[PDB]
Design a protein around this ligand. Structure first.
Ligand SMILES: NC(=O)c1ccc[n+]([C@@H]2O[C@H](COP(=O)([O-])OP(=O)(O)OC[C@H]3O[C@@H](n4cnc5c(N)ncnc54)[C@H](OP(=O)(O)O)[C@@H]3O)[C@@H](O)[C@H]2O)c1
Ligand SMILES: NC(=O)c1ccc[n+]([C@@H]2O[C@H](COP(=O)([O-])OP(=O)(O)OC[C@H]3O[C@@H](n4cnc5c(N)ncnc54)[C@H](OP(=O)(O)O)[C@@H]3O)[C@@H](O)[C@H]2O)c1
Lengths: 248, 248
């Protein structure tokens, strides 16, 4: 039984991989940097010798690539799929680089939608299955200077909240959940603004570590809650139901 | 001075083109079916002899096509861009047709985001410009059996509400607006479910006509409101401010 974690080379996906290794889970770890995926596999084997770890060096910003990824796991028993890979951008809309933003849409929205749709197709009536889509507090509240990225997370939040309630009302075995972190200490900011060195310790007054966010993600999987969300002011993690209007 | 209307060959965009014709505006009408674009241009000339009417047969579900559409309009003075083209689907997520849904994402989301970003880049500091993106009441309220489509509209609403407030806070000249129709008598249901003949008169107990929704769109352009939205319970058209949380 496997747990698929996209965006496993760094940040939340990376630490989630390590936390799930400590539970004896076997992993499919997806990202582009093979080097880091291999060093993580080495950590995972010393944490948990009997875990199986499959690596997949895949750019998920290409729709065909995402299809290929999934059909290549057809002969695996996947209990959890975690749509964690995603990128950010800080800039006024009038200043954006469309090539980067277009790529952001293909990763944040499409890849996640392809994998969620395919997982749901084959796993809705299968006992013990979980889908966890990583949104953001930015997917429930709009943040200045990050309009485009926030809107990808609004998509993710609304899509997962509607998929979750679809599967509940239909009596599915598959459970779908959304994680909405707040500021979490990872590479995300450095990628988003395009230059390294951003220091959360010095520049952000409240943030979780990547390990703390792996821990929240794991508790979300271990709950009957659809939404795991960090409060923007208290930075308490809350497991709760949907935030948006449901017309049902 | 031109008003660009994507999705002009039927429905809201078609009736919007005719309304703006009666005000003497010149139009750039974008859709795939040349046939109907020429039929509308004939109507526009009969309403408005002196209106200029450029037609563009373009599939906007291709990102390159959307760039090409815009770069080809750079010789023109565009006062208004209306991202109206969009497509729906009624289906459990487990039952969708990915090729249809992936095309829906490229049109409902990407096309609109390319055209809005490029319009915003060249027109933010230009007096009298207006960007109007068409979302839906299902972009503020999740509707069963249309999870994926509603999420494209949550993207549109959140993107445009965030862009609108970005332009206000930064003193732009450009105004950005979002329209959120409810049931509107168009080809939209027929295209979404794949089969013709859906009858609003017999099947839907409250709905607006396409001409009424073009009127609401024109009301929204002529206001300081960021949002023009049909209330699901009263079916009154409301001009109001943003609905989502703004962190600034
Ligand atoms: N950090 C925060 O404050 C925060 C808050 C809310 C939500 N989030 C969300 O958290 C998730 C993880 O981000 P993070 O904070 O952990 O940042 P991160 O450390 O930069 O991790 C992003 C991950 O995505 C992978 N990735 C990026 N582009 C990819 C592509 N085209 N194909 C495949 N994999 C790709 C990266 O590895 P490769 O580059 O090697 O592929 C990396 O593993 C994202 O959904 C992000 O939006 C972050
Ligand atoms: N009708 C409703 O109840 C309702 C409610 C809320 C929001 N909306 C929104 O209203 C907008 C307009 O839809 P409508 O109700 O007027 O429906 P419609 O009659 O089906 O018109 C849709 C328009 O989109 C164009 N279009 C579709 N795919 C395209 C593509 N790939 N490239 C270029 N143009 C394309 C169509 O023309 P071609 O096929 O010729 O390209 C047509 O002009 C959509 O954004 C829809 O989501 C509708």
């Amino acid at each position: 039984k496997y747990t698929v974690i996209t965006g496993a080379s760094s940040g939340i996906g990376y630490e989630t991989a390590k936390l799930l290794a400590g539970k004896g889970k076997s992993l499919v770890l997806v990202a582009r940097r093979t080097s880091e995926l291999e060093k993580l596999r080495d950590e995972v084997k010393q944490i948990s010798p009997d875990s199986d770890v499959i690596l997949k060096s895949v750019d998920l910003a290409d729709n065909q690539n995402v299809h290929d990824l999934y059909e290549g796991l057809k002969e695996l028993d996947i209990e959890t799929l975690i749509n964690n890979a995603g990128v950010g951008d800080f800039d006024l809309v009038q200043d954006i680089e469309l090539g980067k933003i277009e790529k952001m849409l293909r990763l944040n929205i499409e890849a996640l939608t392809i994998l969620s749709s395919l997982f749901a197709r084959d796993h809705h009536d299968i006992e013990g299955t979980t889908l966890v889509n990583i949104s953001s507090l930015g997917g429930y509240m709009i943040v200045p200077n990050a309009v485009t990225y926030c809107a990808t997370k609004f998509y993710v939040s609304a899509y997962t909240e509607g998929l979750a309630q679809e599967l509940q009302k239909g009596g599915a075995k598959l459970r779908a959940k959304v994680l909405a972190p707040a500021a979490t200490e990872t590479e995300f900011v450095d990628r988003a603004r395009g230059e390294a060195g951003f220091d959360f310790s010095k520049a952000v007054k409240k943030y979780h570590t990547a390990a703390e966010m792996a821990g929240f993600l794991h508790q979300l999987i271990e709950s009957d809650a659809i939404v795991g969300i960090v409060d923007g002011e208290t930075y308490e993690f809350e497991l709760r139901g949907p935030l948006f209007n449901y017309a049902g």
